[PDB]
Design an enzyme around this catalytic site. Structure first.
Site, PDB file in Angstrom:
ATOM      1  N   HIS A  83       0.832  -1.189   0.000  1.00 45.88           N
ATOM      2  CA  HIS A  83       0.000   0.000   0.000  1.00 45.88           C
ATOM      3  C   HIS A  83       0.872   1.246   0.000  1.00 45.88           C
ATOM      4  O   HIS A  83       1.116   1.851   1.046  1.00 45.88           O
ATOM      5  CB  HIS A  83      -0.932   0.004   1.217  1.00 45.88           C
ATOM      6  N   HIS A  87       0.699   1.363  -5.640  1.00 44.48           N
ATOM      7  CA  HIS A  87      -0.605   0.724  -5.595  1.00 44.48           C
ATOM      8  C   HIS A  87      -1.690   1.765  -5.868  1.00 44.48           C
ATOM      9  O   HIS A  87      -2.659   1.499  -6.587  1.00 44.48           O
ATOM     10  CB  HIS A  87      -0.874   0.066  -4.240  1.00 44.48           C
ATOM     11  N   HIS A 123      -6.140   7.445  -1.742  1.00 45.51           N
ATOM     12  CA  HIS A 123      -6.679   6.562  -0.718  1.00 45.51           C
ATOM     13  C   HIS A 123      -5.752   5.825   0.239  1.00 45.51           C
ATOM     14  O   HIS A 123      -6.174   5.485   1.338  1.00 45.51           O
ATOM     15  CB  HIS A 123      -7.699   5.584  -1.327  1.00 45.51           C
ATOM     16  N   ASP A 124      -4.500   5.590  -0.130  1.00 43.70           N
ATOM     17  CA  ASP A 124      -3.624   4.898   0.803  1.00 43.70           C
ATOM     18  C   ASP A 124      -2.645   5.791   1.555  1.00 43.70           C
ATOM     19  O   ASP A 124      -1.664   5.316   2.120  1.00 43.70           O
ATOM     20  CB  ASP A 124      -2.908   3.735   0.113  1.00 43.70           C
ATOM     21  N   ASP A 218      -9.266  -1.090  -6.623  1.00 41.22           N
ATOM     22  CA  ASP A 218      -8.324  -1.271  -5.530  1.00 41.22           C
ATOM     23  C   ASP A 218      -7.793  -2.700  -5.435  1.00 41.22           C
ATOM     24  O   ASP A 218      -6.701  -2.916  -4.927  1.00 41.22           O
ATOM     25  CB  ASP A 218      -8.969  -0.881  -4.198  1.00 41.22           C
ATOM     26  N   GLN A 254      -4.841 -17.428  -1.718  1.00 46.32           N
ATOM     27  CA  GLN A 254      -5.139 -16.596  -2.879  1.00 46.32           C
ATOM     28  C   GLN A 254      -6.466 -17.063  -3.480  1.00 46.32           C
ATOM     29  O   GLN A 254      -7.328 -16.249  -3.823  1.00 46.32           O
ATOM     30  CB  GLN A 254      -4.025 -16.700  -3.929  1.00 46.32           C
TER      31      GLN A 254
HETATM   32  C1  LIG Z   1      -4.106  -5.917   0.576  1.00 46.50           C
HETATM   33  C2  LIG Z   1      -5.232  -6.793   1.132  1.00 46.50           C
HETATM   34  C3  LIG Z   1      -6.318  -7.037   0.080  1.00 46.50           C
HETATM   35  C4  LIG Z   1      -5.732  -7.718  -1.158  1.00 46.50           C
HETATM   36  N1  LIG Z   1      -5.523  -7.182  -2.358  1.00 46.50           N
HETATM   37  C5  LIG Z   1      -4.960  -8.104  -3.134  1.00 46.50           C
HETATM   38  C6  LIG Z   1      -4.563  -7.879  -4.594  1.00 46.50           C
HETATM   39  C7  LIG Z   1      -4.789  -9.288  -2.428  1.00 46.50           C
HETATM   40  C8  LIG Z   1      -4.256 -10.533  -2.732  1.00 46.50           C
HETATM   41  O1  LIG Z   1      -3.771 -10.774  -3.837  1.00 46.50           O
HETATM   42  N2  LIG Z   1      -4.255 -11.496  -1.717  1.00 46.50           N
HETATM   43  C9  LIG Z   1      -4.787 -11.143  -0.471  1.00 46.50           C
HETATM   44  C10 LIG Z   1      -4.778 -12.072   0.566  1.00 46.50           C
HETATM   45  C11 LIG Z   1      -5.950 -12.365   1.256  1.00 46.50           C
HETATM   46  C12 LIG Z   1      -5.929 -13.296   2.287  1.00 46.50           C
HETATM   47  S1  LIG Z   1      -7.384 -13.696   3.174  1.00 46.50           S
HETATM   48  O2  LIG Z   1      -7.380 -12.966   4.483  1.00 46.50           O
HETATM   49  O3  LIG Z   1      -8.598 -13.306   2.386  1.00 46.50           O
HETATM   50  N3  LIG Z   1      -7.350 -15.307   3.428  1.00 46.50           N
HETATM   51  C13 LIG Z   1      -8.004 -16.035   2.328  1.00 46.50           C
HETATM   52  C14 LIG Z   1      -9.517 -16.147   2.526  1.00 46.50           C
HETATM   53  N4  LIG Z   1      -9.774 -16.787   3.823  1.00 46.50           N
HETATM   54  C15 LIG Z   1     -11.216 -17.028   3.978  1.00 46.50           C
HETATM   55  C16 LIG Z   1     -11.642 -18.201   3.092  1.00 46.50           C
HETATM   56  C17 LIG Z   1      -9.318 -15.858   4.865  1.00 46.50           C
HETATM   57  C18 LIG Z   1      -7.799 -15.699   4.773  1.00 46.50           C
HETATM   58  C19 LIG Z   1      -4.743 -13.937   2.629  1.00 46.50           C
HETATM   59  C20 LIG Z   1      -3.571 -13.641   1.941  1.00 46.50           C
HETATM   60  C21 LIG Z   1      -3.590 -12.708   0.912  1.00 46.50           C
HETATM   61  O4  LIG Z   1      -2.438 -12.373   0.268  1.00 46.50           O
HETATM   62  C22 LIG Z   1      -1.509 -13.467   0.244  1.00 46.50           C
HETATM   63  C23 LIG Z   1      -0.339 -13.095  -0.670  1.00 46.50           C
HETATM   64  N5  LIG Z   1      -5.280  -9.911  -0.267  1.00 46.50           N
HETATM   65  N6  LIG Z   1      -5.291  -9.047  -1.144  1.00 46.50           N
END
Ligand SMILES: CCCc1nc(C)c2c(=O)nc(-c3cc(S(=O)(=O)N4CCN(CC)CC4)ccc3OCC)[nH]n12
Length: 297
Positions: A83, A87, A123-124, A218, A254
């Site tokens: 962030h 980004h 925003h960030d 985003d 992911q």
């Molecule tokens: C910056 C945070 C939001 C975001 N933007 C992007 C492009 C990304 C991305 O690629 N990957 C993540 C991203 C999201 C999660 S999570 O919290 O959603 N995780 C998976 C879902 N489970 C529930 C079934 C909970 C735990 C975990 C890891 C993440 O990034 C790993 C590289 N987040 N993310």
């Protein structure tokens, strides 16, 4: 950087010729900023404002726009792996691609577009960090401070009401990047679409769409060509690991993130405009890639 250095940067930017959107490739959803210098991201930003008719429609002085862009950039909190300015710049680029290639431009007013671009880029700012780790609360205060700071007032040409309206939307747009808010209001959006009741003429629905669009831009890194998505996912992991201070689970997560948060949003966006399909397509492709890895490559 020092005062002299910031001055030279502004000098170089303001005098530089701004390449066309085509030359800069900012109209492509697959756009990548990896080989671009900060100066080049600034030129890209100027082009976005220009081709969206914001510079013209709102009488923005070249020097003021250059200064505001540089002020936003230099003010991003240092040592944040994901962030950061890049980004924010990418979020803005995706917004530009969605408005142009995605053909969403004619669905919004010039003020909404003005606000969306500013919010994407700002925003960030004032990033503080924190699953529930991706539930960050964004802060629009610094965005407004910079917008109102002497020498950077790009909204100086707006009437009192246009300005008040713009700031309201900017605030809503920034807060919309809070995933908790996206998760809280997306159900309504998906149902309206499912029942063929989505109506952008309705003020409340227009506002809902703007919030959903902010989220889509985003999170757009998740839609990029595989090599690009792989690198930005590393940045995401690095930011979380930096807060922490494992990896074998990234692939599974992911896929979980894509399934729980992303896919349905890009699917819905495609209903509002078929031309936004590339984002959905890219997301589906990355899900497949990650799934292959998760099942053990
Ligand atoms: C910056 C945070 C939001 C975001 N933007 C992007 C492009 C990304 C991305 O690629 N990957 C993540 C991203 C999201 C999660 S999570 O919290 O959603 N995780 C998976 C879902 N489970 C529930 C079934 C909970 C735990 C975990 C890891 C993440 O990034 C790993 C590289 N987040 N993310």
């Amino acid at each position: 950087g020092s005062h002299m250095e910031e001055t030279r940067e502004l000098q170089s930017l303001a005098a530089a010729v701004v390449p066309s959107a085509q030359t800069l490739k900012i109209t492509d959803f697959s756009f990548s900023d990896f080989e671009l210098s900060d100066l080049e991201t600034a030129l890209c930003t100027i082009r976005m404002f220009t081709d969206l008719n914001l510079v013209q429609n709102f009488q923005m002085k070249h020097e003021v726009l250059c200064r505001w862009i540089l002020s936003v950039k230099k003010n991003y909190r240092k040592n944040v792996a994901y962030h950061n300015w890049r980004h924010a710049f990418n979020t803005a680029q995706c917004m530009f691609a969605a408005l142009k290639a995605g053909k969403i431009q004619n669905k919004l007013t010039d003020l909404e577009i003005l606000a969306l671009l500013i919010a994407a880029l700002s925003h960030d700012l004032d990033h503080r960090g924190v699953c529930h780790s991706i539930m960050e609360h964004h802060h629009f205060d610094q965005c407004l401070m910079i917008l109102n700071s002497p020498g950077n007032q790009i909204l100086s040409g707006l009437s009192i009401e246009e300005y008040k309206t713009t700031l309201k939307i900017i605030k809503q747009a920034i807060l919309a990047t809070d995933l908790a808010l996206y998760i809280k209001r997306r159900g309504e959006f998906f149902e309206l679409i499912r029942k063929n009741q989505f109506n952008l003429e309705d003020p409340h629905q227009k506002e809902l769409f703007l919030a959903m669009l902010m989220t889509a831009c985003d999170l757009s890194a998740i839609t990029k060509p595989w090599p690009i998505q792989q690198r930005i996912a590393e940045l995401v992991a690095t930011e979380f690991f930096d807060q922490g201070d494992k990896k074998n689970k990234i692939p599974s997560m992911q896929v979980g993130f894509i399934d729980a948060i992303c896919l349905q949003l890009y699917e819905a966006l495609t209903h509002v405009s078929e031309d936004c399909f590339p984002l959905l397509d890219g997301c589906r492709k990355n899900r497949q890639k990650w799934q292959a890895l998760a099942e053990q490559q």
